[PDB]
């Protein structure tokens, strides 16, 4: 298993070297998004938390298609204030309830090193 702590400050660096293989190795959910919110990567652990199948969720819109319950000011709005600003780094608690048992999680979103793309890291709470 891969040694990185959630909320780690330099985390967007650490993961800069991970492939889809090394990503499934973490202790917590990891989604890589573009600016439109289409999903570029999606780890085993977020599959574990949400019951979604990592491999099929790739290419879908996170906020249109995969998780409509994050299409609020308090999540999607955040995300998109970040994308136009060019910078994003926020952590917050949040309840995933879409087509699933309501699950309280903590969320950290953050801009990745790579061009136009963003992470969301998720862990139970």
CSV table of C-alpha atoms in Angstrom, one decimal:
chain,number,residue,atom,x,y,z
A,1,UNK,CA,0.0,0.0,0.0
A,2,UNK,CA,1.2,3.6,-0.8
A,3,UNK,CA,2.3,5.8,2.0
A,4,UNK,CA,0.5,9.1,1.8
A,5,UNK,CA,-1.7,10.9,4.4
A,6,UNK,CA,-5.0,12.5,3.4
A,7,UNK,CA,-4.7,16.3,3.4
A,8,UNK,CA,-1.0,16.0,3.0
A,9,UNK,CA,0.2,19.5,1.8
A,10,UNK,CA,2.5,18.2,-0.9
A,11,UNK,CA,0.1,15.6,-2.0
A,12,UNK,CA,-0.5,17.0,-5.5
A,13,UNK,CA,3.2,16.4,-5.9
A,14,UNK,CA,3.3,12.8,-4.5
A,15,UNK,CA,0.5,11.7,-6.8
A,16,UNK,CA,2.1,13.5,-9.8
A,17,UNK,CA,4.1,10.3,-10.2
A,18,UNK,CA,1.2,7.8,-9.8
A,19,UNK,CA,-0.4,5.7,-12.6
A,20,UNK,CA,-3.8,4.1,-12.3
A,21,UNK,CA,-2.1,1.1,-10.6
A,22,UNK,CA,-0.2,3.1,-7.9
A,23,UNK,CA,-3.5,5.1,-7.3
A,24,UNK,CA,-5.5,2.1,-6.1
A,25,UNK,CA,-2.9,1.8,-3.4
A,26,UNK,CA,-4.1,4.6,-1.2
A,27,UNK,CA,-6.0,4.7,2.0
A,28,UNK,CA,-8.7,7.0,0.6
A,29,UNK,CA,-10.7,8.0,-2.5
A,30,UNK,CA,-9.0,9.7,-5.3
A,31,UNK,CA,-10.7,11.3,-8.2
A,32,UNK,CA,-8.9,13.3,-10.9
A,33,UNK,CA,-11.1,15.7,-12.8
A,34,UNK,CA,-10.7,18.1,-15.7
A,35,UNK,CA,-12.3,21.7,-15.6
A,36,UNK,CA,-15.6,20.4,-17.0
A,37,UNK,CA,-15.6,17.8,-14.4
A,38,UNK,CA,-15.2,14.8,-16.6
A,39,UNK,CA,-13.4,12.0,-14.7
A,40,UNK,CA,-9.8,11.3,-15.7
A,41,UNK,CA,-8.9,8.9,-13.0
A,42,UNK,CA,-10.8,7.1,-10.2
A,43,UNK,CA,-9.3,4.9,-7.5
A,44,UNK,CA,-10.4,1.6,-6.0
A,45,UNK,CA,-11.1,3.3,-2.6
A,46,UNK,CA,-13.7,5.7,-3.9
A,47,UNK,CA,-15.2,2.7,-5.5
A,48,UNK,CA,-15.2,1.2,-2.0
A,49,UNK,CA,-16.8,4.2,-0.3
A,50,UNK,CA,-19.4,4.9,-3.1
A,51,UNK,CA,-20.1,1.4,-4.6
A,52,UNK,CA,-19.2,2.7,-8.1
A,53,UNK,CA,-17.0,0.6,-10.4
A,54,UNK,CA,-13.8,2.5,-11.0
A,55,UNK,CA,-13.3,1.5,-14.6
A,56,UNK,CA,-16.8,2.5,-15.9
A,57,UNK,CA,-17.0,5.9,-14.3
A,58,UNK,CA,-14.1,7.3,-16.5
A,59,UNK,CA,-15.2,9.8,-19.1
A,60,UNK,CA,-18.5,10.6,-17.3
A,61,UNK,CA,-19.3,14.0,-15.8
A,62,UNK,CA,-18.9,13.9,-12.0
A,63,UNK,CA,-21.6,16.5,-11.4
A,64,UNK,CA,-23.9,15.8,-14.3
A,65,UNK,CA,-23.8,12.0,-14.5
A,66,UNK,CA,-22.1,10.3,-11.6
A,67,UNK,CA,-23.0,12.4,-8.5
A,68,UNK,CA,-25.8,15.0,-8.8
A,69,UNK,CA,-25.8,15.4,-5.1
A,70,UNK,CA,-22.6,17.4,-5.4
A,71,UNK,CA,-24.4,19.9,-7.8
A,72,UNK,CA,-24.9,22.5,-5.2
A,73,UNK,CA,-23.1,25.7,-4.2
A,74,UNK,CA,-21.4,23.9,-1.4
A,75,UNK,CA,-19.5,21.4,-3.7
A,76,UNK,CA,-19.9,22.0,-7.4
A,77,UNK,CA,-19.9,25.8,-6.9
A,78,UNK,CA,-16.7,25.5,-5.1
A,79,UNK,CA,-15.1,23.4,-7.7
A,80,UNK,CA,-16.0,25.9,-10.4
A,81,UNK,CA,-14.9,29.0,-8.5
A,82,UNK,CA,-11.5,27.1,-8.3
A,83,UNK,CA,-11.4,26.3,-12.1
A,84,UNK,CA,-11.9,29.8,-13.3
A,85,UNK,CA,-9.6,31.3,-10.6
A,86,UNK,CA,-6.8,28.9,-11.4
A,87,UNK,CA,-6.4,27.6,-7.9
A,88,UNK,CA,-8.3,25.5,-5.5
A,89,UNK,CA,-7.7,24.0,-2.1
A,90,UNK,CA,-10.6,23.3,0.2
A,91,UNK,CA,-11.6,20.7,2.7
A,92,UNK,CA,-15.1,20.1,3.9
A,93,UNK,CA,-17.4,17.4,5.2
A,94,UNK,CA,-20.2,16.3,3.1
A,95,UNK,CA,-22.9,13.5,2.9
A,96,UNK,CA,-22.9,11.3,-0.3
A,97,UNK,CA,-26.5,10.1,-0.7
A,98,UNK,CA,-27.1,9.4,-4.4
A,99,UNK,CA,-28.6,6.0,-5.0
A,100,UNK,CA,-26.7,4.7,-2.0
A,101,UNK,CA,-26.9,4.6,1.8
A,102,UNK,CA,-26.2,8.1,3.2
A,103,UNK,CA,-22.5,8.2,3.9
A,104,UNK,CA,-20.8,11.2,5.7
A,105,UNK,CA,-17.3,11.7,4.2
A,106,UNK,CA,-14.7,14.3,4.3
A,107,UNK,CA,-13.6,15.9,1.1
A,108,UNK,CA,-10.5,17.7,0.1
A,109,UNK,CA,-10.4,19.2,-3.4
A,110,UNK,CA,-7.1,20.6,-4.8
A,111,UNK,CA,-5.5,21.7,-8.1
A,112,UNK,CA,-3.1,19.2,-9.6
A,113,UNK,CA,0.3,20.0,-10.9
A,114,UNK,CA,-0.7,18.7,-14.4
A,115,UNK,CA,-2.2,21.4,-16.6
A,116,UNK,CA,-6.0,21.8,-16.3
A,117,UNK,CA,-6.9,19.2,-13.7
A,118,UNK,CA,-8.1,18.8,-10.2
A,119,UNK,CA,-8.3,16.2,-7.4
A,120,UNK,CA,-10.9,15.2,-5.0
A,121,UNK,CA,-9.8,13.0,-2.1
A,122,UNK,CA,-12.5,11.3,0.0
A,123,UNK,CA,-12.4,9.4,3.3
A,124,UNK,CA,-15.0,8.1,5.7
A,125,UNK,CA,-15.7,10.2,8.8
